């Protein structure tokens, strides 16, 4: 419990940090530092989600992940998280892997869509881990 709650806080903090830095979104598309902040707090969100997943896979011996995406696959296979949520959380990993490098393979439209209609997925994930 002690580590799962610590990671829940970091997601809650990072979600709020995204919302604060993005705000209206008008200035976001032009200001690079605003993008750099949002990209990092999105990375911290899915990295803390993998950290939670891997802890459940460890305490319940669900399996050994063959990929970072596999961390959510094991929870979905063991019916701990719903299949559409698993697919969404695996899409977040994809964003992290591209965004870990320089903003040259950029898709600001994809970053904006995650802030607008996909931050709910991280919150939805917290709502199912709390039911231990």
């Amino acid at each position: 419990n002690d580590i799962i709650i610590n990671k829940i806080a970091t997601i809650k903090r990072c979600i709020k940090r995204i919302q604060q830095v993005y705000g209206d979104g008008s200035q976001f598309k032009q200001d690079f530092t605003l993008q750099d902040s949002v990209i990092l707090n999105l990375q911290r969100c899915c990295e803390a989600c993998i950290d939670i997943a891997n802890h459940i896979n460890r305490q319940q011996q669900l399996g050994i992940p063959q990929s970072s995406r596999d961390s959510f696959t094991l929870l979905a296979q063991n019916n701990l998280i719903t299949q559409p949520l698993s697919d969404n959380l695996k899409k977040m990993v994809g964003l992290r892997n591209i965004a870990v490098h320089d903003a040259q393979e950029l898709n600001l439209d994809i970053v904006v869509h995650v802030v607008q209609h996909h931050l709910e997925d991280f919150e939805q994930f917290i709502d199912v881990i709390k039911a231990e």
């Binding site: 950290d51 891997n54 011996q61 050994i64 992940p65 063959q66 990929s67 961390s71 892997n97």
Partner: protein, 124 residues
């Protein structure tokens, strides 16, 4: 092993093909009697699970041996690492191979840090 036969069948059937690798027993030389040929391919798009299986069986018929065809675009990081380390490139540019390896090794190094606890717990 007819590598030319392998290159021709895959090029003739996979659109936007970028890389062809030979891995497993055959790449090393441990190729025995009831051996299974292992091929890893990378194209612009992912190959459908059904379509890829049917293609492996086409190669299997022409090679007179069981073939395991792996789509690098949808395979695990563990499998991709096994191909970059043990595999022999049959087709594709030197650049594409290097780009694939850099992406793979980085992703595998990150996965090792994430799952180290799970690995230790099972391996005692």
């Amino acid at each position: 092993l007819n590598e030319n036969k392998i290159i021709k069948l895959l090029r003739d059937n996979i659109p936007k093909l970028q890389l062809i690798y030979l891995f497993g027993s055959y790449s090393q030389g441990t190729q025995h009697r009831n051996s299974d040929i292992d091929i890893a391919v990378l194209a612009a798009d992912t190959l459908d699970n059904i379509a890829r299986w049917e293609l492996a069986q086409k190669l299997a018929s022409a090679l007179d041996s069981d073939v395991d065809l792996v789509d690098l675009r949808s395979a695990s990081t563990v499998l991709c690492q096994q191909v970059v380390t043990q595999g022999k490139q049959l087709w594709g540019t030197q650049q594409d191979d290097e780009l694939f390896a850099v992406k793979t090794i980085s992703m595998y190094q990150h996965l090792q840090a994430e799952r180290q606890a799970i690995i230790d717990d099972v391996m005692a």
